[PDB]
Design a binder for these strands. Structure first.
Length: 437
RNA sequence: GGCCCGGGGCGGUUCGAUUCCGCCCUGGGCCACA
């Protein structure tokens, strides 16, 4: 029931069992033999190469080394031919540069081409940096592979493990650097409780200082922040999580939380209880990768939230959910309906010129003086948040993300009420409103 | 694709805009993917 106790039991959820290990070992062996039969210059990297991969995420990473002089095009072509002949099944994948994904004796494999170099300088792409990251780590993490797994298991269980945009959490690399710095999971967790948004962890110098942003300097390049994509809020969630764990250690921190569904009926009652306006913007999900899509959902979500605040609808929070089918931007506002009239500030009574221009506008109500300046009663084009957004989304589709915006232009509808509780967003809404139980 | 800094033209709104909402060109930095 104490820290050490829970951690022993926790290993059982993060460390791969022998069957997963053997399975990987057997594929690595066969993979070596196949690569050697073509006399290919390669180097295994990543969590598999260093036995730090989390249970259930066995994936082998093989980077193909290429002379500095080779053209970026030769790399991909020869890179493609090589993965082709060595994999049981292949599938060209992409990123900064293309590569090949596939299978071998049951396990996932990534065949990636990079430049064989020396000295981080002369680098050309993130992929070239990966081997250096690998070298720096193989000597220093040996022996603490399970501390890495506990850290990864902890983060994953709490939805902040990957560094991709859908997550904005802590990359695997980041986790290993943290273990090398603190020595173990518990030490990392114990100290993270004192982390601030100004913390700078410099691995190479074995130092922690106060900078301008959360910054974990890459031992391989002092200018690179390894936690660059860790969001401010995800950082906050981690620090808070560490405080709670240290105060009441539980194995629950390493178990994925149950989706805990809710009957749409109860959701309705809660929204009625809140007296708020709850609605969603629904449109078709553009066929793009999560890495281009989520940042677009975040922007679109924010531009609308911003429209809602300047338009005085008192938005509480925004959210969004993507599906195979559509995307949903979710909102909740304190104001279901606002009056048509509102007041417009005018010039000070002294400014005869501007006062005169200000009184030339034909208005339905007649302006007045108050505290030394003129004011005008004006009429709104819309009186509900839904109306406002239908208006905003129809004309400002372009500012809502390149793709999301293009899809919104060709189609979008606003759903509210019972018709909304039937969409696949009941979970995002419960989180947005802090529904508990 | 998104985010940060900077430039050159515009449209709309406002008594008044560099300064609100947005649109075209456009230079630099960065991030995710591998």
């Amino acid at each position: 029931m104490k820290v050490e106790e829970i951690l022993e039991k926790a290993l059982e959820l993060v460390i791969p069992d022998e069957e997963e290990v053997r399975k990987g070992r057997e594929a690595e062996e066969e993979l070596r033999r196949r690569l050697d039969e073509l006399g290919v210059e390669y180097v295994f990297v990543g969590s598999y190469a260093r036995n730090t991969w989390l249970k259930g995420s066995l994936e082998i990473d093989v980077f193909l080394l290429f002379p500095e002089e080779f053209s970026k095009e030769e790399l991909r072509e020869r890179g493609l031919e090589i993965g082709k002949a060595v994999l049981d099944s292949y599938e060209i994948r992409y990123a900064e540069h293309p590569y090949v994904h596939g299978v071998v004796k049951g396990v996932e494999v990534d065949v990636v081409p990079c430049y064989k170099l020396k000295e981080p300088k002369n680098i050309k792409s993130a992929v070239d940096r990966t081997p250096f990251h690998h070298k720096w780590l193989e000597g220093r993490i040996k022996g603490k592979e399970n501390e890495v797994r506990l850290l990864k298991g902890f983060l994953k269980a709490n939805g902040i493990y990957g560094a991709e945009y859908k997550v904005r959490g802590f990359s695997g690399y980041l986790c290993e650097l943290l273990i090398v710095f603190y020595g173990s999971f518990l030490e990392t967790v114990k100290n993270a409780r004192r982390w601030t948004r100004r913390t700078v962890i410099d691995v190479a110098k074995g130092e922690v200082r106060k900078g301008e942003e959360f910054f974990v300097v890459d031992p391989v390049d002092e200018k690179r922040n390894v936690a660059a994509n860790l969001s401010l809020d995800n950082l906050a969630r981690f620090v808070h999580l560490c405080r709670e764990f240290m105060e009441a250690p539980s194995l629950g921190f390493f178990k994925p939380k149950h989706p805990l569904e809710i009957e749409p009926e109860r959701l309705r009652k809660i929204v009625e209880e809140r007296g708020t306006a709850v609605f969603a913007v629904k449109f078709r999900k553009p066929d793009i990768v999560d890495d281009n899509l989520y940042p677009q959902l975040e922007r679109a979500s924010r531009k609308i939230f911003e429209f809602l605040e300047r338009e005085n609808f008192m938005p509480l929070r925004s959210a969004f959910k993507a599906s195979e089918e559509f995307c949903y931007l979710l909102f909740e506002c304190q104001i279901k309906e606002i009056s048509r009239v509102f007041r417009r500030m005018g010039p000070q009574f002294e400014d005869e010129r501007n006062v005169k221009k200000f009184l030339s506008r034909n208005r339905a109500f007649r302006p007045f003086i108050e505290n030394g300046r003129w004011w005008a009663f004006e009429m709104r084009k819309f009186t509900t948040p839904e109306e406002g957004v239908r208006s905003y989304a129809s004309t400002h589709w372009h500012t809502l993300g390149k793709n999301v915006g293009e899809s919104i232009r060709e189609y979008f509808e606003i759903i509210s009420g019972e018709k909304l509780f039937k969409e696949p967003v009941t979970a995002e809404l419960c989180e947005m409103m802090g529904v508990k139980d």
